Amino acid sequence: PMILGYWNVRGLTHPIRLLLEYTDSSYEEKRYAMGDAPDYDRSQWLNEKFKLGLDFPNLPYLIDGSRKITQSNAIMRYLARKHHLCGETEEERIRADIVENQVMDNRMQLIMLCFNPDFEKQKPEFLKTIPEKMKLYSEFLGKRPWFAGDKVTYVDFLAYDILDQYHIFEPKCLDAFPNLKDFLARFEGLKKISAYMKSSRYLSTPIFSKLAQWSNK
Amino acid sequence: PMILGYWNVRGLTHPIRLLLEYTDSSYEEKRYAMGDAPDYDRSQWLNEKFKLGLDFPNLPYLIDGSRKITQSNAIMRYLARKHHLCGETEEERIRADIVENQVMDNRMQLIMLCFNPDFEKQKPEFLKTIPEKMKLYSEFLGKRPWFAGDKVTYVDFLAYDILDQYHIFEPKCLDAFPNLKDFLARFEGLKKISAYMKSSRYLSTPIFSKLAQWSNK
Numbered sequence: 137p138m139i140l141g142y143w144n145v146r147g148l149t150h151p152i153r154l155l156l157e158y159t160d161s162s163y164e165e166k167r168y169a170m171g172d173a174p175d176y177d178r179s180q181w182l183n184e185k186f187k188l189g190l191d192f193p194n195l196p197y198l199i200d201g202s203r204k205i206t207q208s209n210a211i212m213r214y215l216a217r218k219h220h221l222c223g224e225t226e227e228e229r230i231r232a233d234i235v236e237n238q239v240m241d242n243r244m245q246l247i248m249l250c251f252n253p254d255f256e257k258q259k260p261e262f263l264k265t266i267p268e269k270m271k272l273y274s275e276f277l278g279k280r281p282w283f284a285g286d287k288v289t290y291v292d293f294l295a296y297d298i299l300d301q302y303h304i305f306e307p308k309c310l311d312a313f314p315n316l317k318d319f320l321a322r323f324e325g326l327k328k329i330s331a332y333m334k335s336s337r338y339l340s341t342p343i344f345s346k347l348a349q350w351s352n353k
Numbered sequence: 354p355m356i357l358g359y360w361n362v363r364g365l366t367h368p369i370r371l372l373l374e375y376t377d378s379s380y381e382e383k384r385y386a387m388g389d390a391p392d393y394d395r396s397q398w399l400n401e402k403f404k405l406g407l408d409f410p411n412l413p414y415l416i417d418g419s420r421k422i423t424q425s426n427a428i429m430r431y432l433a434r435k436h437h438l439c440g441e442t443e444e445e446r447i448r449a450d451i452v453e454n455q456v457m458d459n460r461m462q463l464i465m466l467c468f469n470p471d472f473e474k475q476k477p478e479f480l481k482t483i484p485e486k487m488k489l490y491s492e493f494l495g496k497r498p499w500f501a502g503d504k505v506t507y508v509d510f511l512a513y514d515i516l517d518q519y520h521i522f523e524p525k526c527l528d529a530f531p532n533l534k535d536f537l538a539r540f541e542g543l544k545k546i547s548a549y550m551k552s553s554r555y556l557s558t559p560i561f562s563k564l565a566q567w568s569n570k
């Protein structure tokens with residue numbers, strides 16, 4: 137079995153857990169526990185961070201036999217080439233690449249707001265930016281069934297995850313973009329995805345670590 | 354020719370600039386200017402931001418004929434594919450994808466301390482962390498000529514820039530890692546790169562905008 141290591145929170149690893157499930161991968165998990173406030177003890181991880189053979193010790197990590205990978209996109213891409221879920225055309229590939237990075241940016245934005253102590257007074261500002269973000273995803277996907285075109289790629293995994301977290305942080309943000317609502321439902325409707333979602337392993341929340349101002353619980 | 358869109362700072366776009374040179378690309382640039390303090394006028398870029406046909410408008414952007422791309426790593430992948438500068442084996446691709454995301458992490462960490470109002474007091478703690486950042490690279494590179502292995506790929510462009518910026522920040526941070534230093538001199542030795550560096554095109558400074566407590570002018 138493959139081993140996925142991460143905190144016991146959604147974090148940035150959902151697309152990975154969903155990809156694992158989607159490709160029917162055999163894997164085990166290491167969900168490292170984080171210490172409560174104000175210490176936020178991380179020795180569950182730290183006791184073995186330098187003891188696992190990884191080039192750049194980090195969470196998440198994927199152990200696949202001899203191969204030891206870190207950096208979530210890096211992990212996503214490995215699984216993707218493994219199950220032919222990479223773009224097939226140059227245009228597929230440009231779309232994917234942009235999407236990949238676009239998701240992480242939109243994700244840091246969220247993070248940066250949810251770990252800042254000034255959350256409360258930062259939120260209304262942040263809120264003003266969301267409709268553009270969504271519009272961008274909505275006009276880019278357009279009428280395509282999947283973000284890269286006609287077939288599911290690893291980028292839909294990342295895409296699903298960050299829009300659902302945004303949807304979750306702002307429930308009515310997809311109201312104006314029904315193609316995005318339909319996308320989440322199509323993704324969600326995938327056989328193995330539906331399935332995992334009802335599983336003992338599903339882990340939707342908390343979205344962040346106990347250090348966050350939002351979805352820390 | 355092609356067009357590269359970006360502020361008139363080094364920021365995160367050095368790799369693209371060196372890739373375009375190294376590939377003998379026919380490109381022109383649109384270096385936008387940011388007003389000064391306190392205003393910090395962006396109107397020069399904002400007024401055409403949504404009028405370029407980009408899906409997710411950003412800086413940098415690459416216009417190559419019909420193709421419009423955003424997100425520095427996507428741009429880099431794009432040129433990588435165009436000129437065959439990616440890993441050719443699974444192991445090279447993994448190394449490449451891990452390195453690509455690793456650089457930007459280390460990128461972020463540097464920038465999170467230079468666009469930090471408290472730069473100077475947290476500076477002494479970041480410099481403490483630098484020797485283990487550099488050590489990971491050093492150990493990862495090993496005896497190899499290039500980060501992926503046998504030939505040059507786009508991640509070397511990436512690796513070179515962030516190692517060069519850490520180096521500028523901390524001039525002795527490479528003294529214990531001489532192979533990193535040979536990486537840098539060897540990267541500077543590629544003919545088209547050599548030439549470019551001595552050209553009117555080269556922009557090695559400043560790294561950041563105005564609002565930074567490093568590469569501030």
Ligand SMILES: N[C@@H](CCC(=O)N[C@@H](CS[C@@H]1c2ccccc2-c2ccccc2[C@H]1O)C(=O)NCC(=O)O)C(=O)O
Nearest residue numbers: 147148185194195196207208209247343344345454458
């Ligand atoms: N560029 C890396 C991000 C890596 C990362 O920051 N790893 C964090 C976990 S995600 C982490 C996080 C924790 C809880 C909740 C949310 C997040 C998060 C989400 C997205 C992006 C960044 C953060 C992280 O910093 C960490 O714990 N590293 C191991 C260690 O330092 O020893 C990736 O894409 O894999």
Ligand SMILES: N[C@@H](CCC(=O)N[C@@H](CS[C@@H]1c2ccccc2-c2ccccc2[C@H]1O)C(=O)NCC(=O)O)C(=O)O
Nearest residue numbers: 237241364365411412413423424425426464560561562
């Ligand atoms: N993840 C995207 C980052 C995109 C980004 O934030 N672009 C910044 C410029 S880099 C930006 C920068 C600005 C000022 C000074 C320096 C830089 C910088 C330097 C290093 C690293 C990153 C940056 C960003 O903060 C921006 O100005 N976008 C246009 C806009 O939002 O409308 C990329 O990889 O392409």
